[model samples]
Target: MSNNQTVLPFDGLNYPEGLAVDTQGAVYVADRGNNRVVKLAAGSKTQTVLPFTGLNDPDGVAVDNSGNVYVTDTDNNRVVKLEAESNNQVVLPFTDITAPWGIAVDEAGTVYVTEHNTNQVVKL
Candidate 1:
């Protein structure tokens, strides 16, 4: 079972939850316990901690074609979009969502979120 297995070095992750892989093969991790997201870029040995502001218990993540990252801020009951290679985070326009838990983004840039509290999936 060890054949063709690759092991990458990673540390300092606490309660890491949801994750995503982008078009460039870079890996993204939602460090829920640390209230941050980290990225291991394609062909890179070191992982970089993404700059996310005011993230609270992020539970799900998705990456778009443009490398934009979307995450469900579970505790905050909202979804946030972090622009690729930038420190900007835009909250999706769904202030009424309760306990947004899962997220996904389609090629057309449409976002979908699953509300844990409401038991519904909302598209935006």
Candidate 2:
């Protein structure tokens, strides 16, 4: 079963790549050119550009039920997890991989990431 495609208004994002929708109806995006992850709250017109350090060419964005945001730092070869109002971010343990992209989190909180250079999907 597939749903119809619905496009939202442009929000001044450059090279927007992967996106995810949370259970609360919030939307998250990996803004590539800006090198940041953004959140569009449910029913809100504006998006919040998340502040992160050492981020480069983010390619994917995902959110769990607990509101933890995940992003694939493609050029950096790592996956980062951010929490609300937290000063520090956690990097997921995924080694020996390049160009990590297209991330997702399941209901059980298991993380899945697709790799561009390796051509494989990894579970973490």
Candidate 3:
């Protein structure tokens, strides 16, 4: 038998994928269809939006210990980092990348990204 418990409602999400939880228990969802990341406050409907305007197909997302967000710009074929409490953005561009997919961050601040076409995971 399978047991299921209800948490948040469907909330009308579109193509919802990729997720991360902050230390404060807030849930962040990569709303790919909307081209943005949304943060759901713990036990509340309040949401904070991290707009990824002018960015292409954000497929995967990960957050470091310091709350820095790393996103894989799949269509753009690159990885980008968004600072936690600031508007600073860093783009790690690699022309060799074609369709970057999964992303992860380690405690040492190393970022790992998967290149779909190359079928390899690179640490940067």
**What TM-score would candidate 3 get against the native?**
0.85
Candidate that would win on lDDT: 2
Cα lDDT of model 2 by residue, 36-92, tens digit: 888888878888877667899999999888888899999999999887666469988
What is the lDDT, from 0 to 100, of the residue 81 in candidate 1?
A: 92
Judge candidate 3 at residue 112 and give its lDDT: 86
Q: Compared with the true structure, what per-residue lDDT tens digits does model 1 show for residues 33-66? A: 9888888988788998877788899888899998
Model 3 lDDT per residue over 42-105, tens place: 8876677775555677778888899888888788777878887885888875557888888888
Query: lDDT value for candidate 1?
Result: 0.85
Clashing residue pairs, backbone N/CA/C < 3 A, model 3: none
Error of 3 at 64 (Å): 0.7
Q: Can you give the TM-score per candidate against the true fold?
A: 0.90, 0.87, 0.85
The window of 10 residues in a row where model 1 has the poorest summed lDDT is 2-11
How does model 3 fare in lDDT?
A: 0.77
What lDDT would candidate 2 get against the real structure?
0.87
lDDT of 1 at 98: 88
Name the runs in model 3 displaced over 4 angstroms. Answer: 1-4, 93-95
Sort by lDDT, best first: 2, 1, 3
Candidate 1 residue pairs in backbone clash = none
